[PDB]
Amino acid sequence: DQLTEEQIAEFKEAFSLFDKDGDGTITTKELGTVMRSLGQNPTEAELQDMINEVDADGNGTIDFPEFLTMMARKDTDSEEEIREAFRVFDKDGNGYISAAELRHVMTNLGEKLTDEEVDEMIREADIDGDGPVNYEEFVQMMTA
Amino acid sequence: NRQIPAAASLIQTAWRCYAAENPDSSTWKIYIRISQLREHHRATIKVIRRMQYFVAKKKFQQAR
Ligand SMILES: [Ca+2]
Numbered sequence: 655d656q657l658t659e660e661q662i663a664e665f666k667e668a669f670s671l672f673d674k675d676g677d678g679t680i681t682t683k684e685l686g687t688v689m690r691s692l693g694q695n696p697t698e699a700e701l702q703d704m705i706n707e708v709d710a711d712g713n714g715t716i717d718f719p720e721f722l723t724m725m726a727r728k729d730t731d732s733e734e735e736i737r738e739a740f741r742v743f744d745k746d747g748n749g750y751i752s753a754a755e756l757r758h759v760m761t762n763l764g765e766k767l768t769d770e771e772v773d774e775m776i777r778e779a780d781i782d783g784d785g786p787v788n789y790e791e792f793v794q795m796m797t798a
Numbered sequence: 799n800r801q802i803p804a805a806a807s808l809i810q811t812a813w814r815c816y817a818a819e820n821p822d823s824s825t826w827k828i829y830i831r832i833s834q835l836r837e838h839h840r841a842t843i844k845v846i847r848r849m850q851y852f853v854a855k856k857k858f859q860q861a862r
């Protein structure tokens with residue numbers, strides 16, 4: 655890509671928001687205050703899950719360098735994983751999911767998106783009339 | 799098949815992380831606790847969504 659810009663300035667303010675006390679580290683409590691603030695009710699299981707995925711070493715908290723690494727992130731590899739996750743609902747594995755099936759798993763299981771996000775999502779792939787949605791289209795539209 | 803909810807959820811997280819790069823997406827409507835969405839909110843929400851993705855990445859690798 656490019657050398658990070660004045661986004662340095664942006665990401666540090668963002669790290670500021672979780673780092674309530676300025677100790678240059680973000681803890682599960684600190685992430686938990688922010689999320690509940692947002693009306694979310696995460697488990698001390700979930701917080702530790704998020705924390706571990708960005709703690710490069712293992713001091714069990716996030717410093718700013720790790721934070722930067724996280725907000726600066728994978729060629730085709732991250733593309734292939736989503737492309738796989740769709741293939742799990744590709745019944746025949748043709749390469750198309752139905753709009754109804756897509757809508758259904760999107761609304762009814764996993765993170766249970768809302769009816770009006772599925773709409774934005776089906777609408778971002780201009781379906782060939784009433785046709786089945788090509789999800790490889792989706793995945794390129796997403797990553798690029 | 800236990801690869802389903804981990805699959806379902808990696809699409810859902812991937813797309814929520816993509817949508818939030820749009821300041822007029824319906825994805826901002828889920829935040830019914832916050833009365834009006836300031837930028838410092840959208841800051842922390844893009845961070846929480848990226849964390850939530852890297853977990854869903856790790857949990858899908860483990861079922862794939
Ligand atoms: Ca702190």
Ligand SMILES: [Ca+2]
Pocket residue numbers: 709710711712713714715716717720
């Ligand atoms: Ca650390």
